[PDB]
Design a protein around this ligand. Structure first.
Ligand code: 1FM
Length: 294
């Protein structure tokens, strides 16, 4: 895999757009176009920036944030600017929050599984993301196109074998994906009710706690979600299987290409009796499903 060699002088560093695992993300201008720059803040980040460089140099997929190139003085990654910001901000950010549909929710998850299945298909060795969560998922094309960034606060999406220090596989990303599917359908932060620190989430998840069940969730979606959540990573489906299932389910989710443009004030969490109400509405799914089946 190859990457551009860029002069920091060619970059017009604009405002800070966020902060990740290491470094800082700024909006910037490079070769008349808009970019996202992840600059180095401390000498300790060098090993991570280099590993991210060699990894992202071989990665080319529509659902993965494109790394245009890099600077080596100072060390900085020049990427495509995801104008729609993070999925976390769309779901849980500052008001006004956008309205979104069951079709957007399923589409975002399909697209995330498409990018992760590409990473897992990597030869000679599969690439594991290890930090799949809404802050690391970015949106473009009016909030309709999802792109994964920052390959590995995260305890709520972490597979129990990972924090157990156990030998884990690409099945840890499948667990995180299952949590994200619950999170987009409910528009709730997973394990928000469990007060911090992280060890309290880890203890609960390690003991079998999973997000509450969704009232009126279609049985095929419920089965997929809970299989992804399995304690035993060998019982979880592969990403290739999630892609196929999610692809087939989209026939009952039209409208995923509709940009996010509507204001939303639905933004009120009802209650918790072991079961939560979905934020999205499955009425149209059930209707479209009946036409095909009976
Ligand atoms: C991808 C994820 C990441 O580090 C997160 O911490 C993220 O939430 C920070 C924000 C990144 C960001 C934000 C915008 O618009 C607000 C646009 C972008 O292109 C990016 C971006 O590319 O972030 C990645 C470098 C990291």
């Amino acid at each position: 895999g190859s990457l551009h060699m860029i002069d920091y002088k060619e970059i017009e560093v604009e405002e800070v757009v966020g902060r990740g695992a290491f470094g800082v993300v700024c909006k910037a201008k490079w070769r008349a176009k808009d970019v996202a720059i992840k600059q180095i803040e401390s000498e300790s980040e060098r090993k991570a920036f280099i590993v991210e460089l060699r990894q992202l140099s071989r990665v080319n997929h529509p659902n993965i944030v494109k790394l245009y190139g890099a600077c080596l003085n100072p060390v900085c990654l020049v990427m495509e600017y995801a104008e729609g910001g993070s999925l976390y901000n769309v779901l849980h950010g500052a008001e006004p929050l956008p309205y979104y549909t069951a079709a957007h929710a399923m589409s975002w998850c399909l697209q995330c599984s498409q990018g992760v299945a590409y990473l897992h298909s990597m030869q000679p060795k599969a690439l594991i993301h290890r930090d799949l969560k809404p802050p690391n998922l970015l949106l473009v094309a009016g909030g309709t196109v999802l792109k994964i960034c920052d390959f590995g606060g995260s305890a709520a999406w972490m597979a129990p074998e990972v924090f157990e220090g156990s030998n884990y596989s690409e099945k840890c990303d499948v667990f995180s994906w299952g949590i994200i599917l619950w999170e987009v359908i409910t528009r709730r932060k997973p394990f928000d009710e469990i007060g911090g620190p992280a060890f309290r989430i880890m203890w609960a998840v390690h003991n079998g706690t999973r997000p509450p069940l969704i009232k009126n969730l279609p049985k095929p979606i419920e089965s997929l979600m809970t299989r992804c959540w399995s304690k035993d990573p060998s019982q979880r489906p592969s990403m290739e299987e999630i892609v196929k299932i999610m692809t087939h389910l989209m026939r009952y989710f039209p409208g995923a290409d509709e940009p996010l443009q509507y204001p939303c004030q639905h933004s009120l969490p009802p209650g918790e009796d072991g079961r939560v109400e979905p934020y999205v509405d499955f009425a149209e799914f059930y209707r479209l499903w009946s036409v095909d089946h009976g």
